């Protein structure tokens, strides 16, 4: 199936390479780049998985209570003949009553865009669920996923994306 392949591709071509190095890049940002009075960036990569596969290019659109702060120090690797392929990740402030309630490295699972660009709304929802299911199995079995990665799967019906992420962020400090 398609979503089987995209989920494995997403692990093998991305998560496998960046998750081992993520904590060091977040440590680096907190200790050097992060402003004196700004909250610490949390230690986990939060991956948004909208089951409708609607992936906007900017998260401020999906919820204005999600505010882009800064980029992490970038990671590079020689891969498939491409010298210094750049792995960049963006930091987001999650706002509650116009004030920062949390900070995290936050992004959509890009391959959901490929399902969206592809044959019905119902069949797409089944592939999106399979993508999530398949990725959950890969990361539950992977040495690189050591509670440094949280999948946030959700169906939009009124909805708060910022509150959905903040729920996950609060569960991790415990």
**Is 165 among the annotated ligand-binding positions?**
no
Cα–Cα distance for residue pair 174/158, rounded to 1 Å? 28
Q: Which stretch binds ligand V5V (CB under 6 A): 11-19, 29-37, 53-61, 164-172?
A: 11-19
Among 3, 55, 91, 111, interactor with ligand V5V by CB under 6 A: 111
Is residue 92 within 8 Å of residue 68, measured between CB atoms?
yes
Among 80, 143, 171, 174, interactor with a copy of itself by CB under 8 A: 80
Breaks in the chain after residues, C-to-N cutoff 2.5 Å: 118, 157
DSSP result, 21-50: HHHHHHHHIIIIIS-TTSPPPPSSEEEEEE
Cα–Cα distance for residue pair 100/102, rounded to 1 Å? 6
Q: Is 13 in the site for ligand V5V (CB under 6 A)?
A: yes
Q: Is 14 in the site for ligand V5V (CB under 6 A)?
A: yes
Q: Which stretch binds ligand V5V (CB under 6 A): 9-17, 33-41, 125-133, 152-160?
A: 9-17
Footprint of a copy of itself (CB under 8 A) = 1-6, 8-9, 12-13, 48, 55-59, 68, 71, 74, 77-86, 88-90, 92, 106-111, 113-114, 117-118
């Amino acid at each position: 199936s398609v979503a089987h392949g995209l989920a494995w591709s997403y692990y093998i071509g991305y998560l496998r390479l960046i998750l081992p190095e993520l904590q060091a890049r977040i440590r680096t940002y907190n200790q050097h780049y992060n402003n004196l009075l700004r909250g610490a960036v949390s230690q986990r990569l939060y991956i948004l998985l909208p089951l409708d596969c609607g992936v906007p290019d900017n998260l401020s659109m999906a919820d204005p209570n999600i505010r882009f702060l800064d980029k992490l120090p970038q990671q590079t690797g020689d891969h498939a003949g491409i010298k210094d392929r750049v792995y960049s990740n963006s930091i987001y402030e999650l706002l509650e009553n116009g004030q920062r309630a949390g900070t995290c490295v936050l992004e959509y699972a890009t391959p959901l865009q490929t399902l969206f660009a592809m044959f019905s709304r119902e069949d797409r929802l089944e592939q999106a669920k399979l993508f999530c299911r398949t990725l959950e199995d890969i990361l539950a079995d992977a040495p690189e996923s050591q509670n440094n990665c949280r999948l946030i799967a959700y169906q939009e019906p009124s909805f708060s994306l910022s509150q959905e992420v903040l729920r996950h962020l609060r569960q991790e400090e415990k």
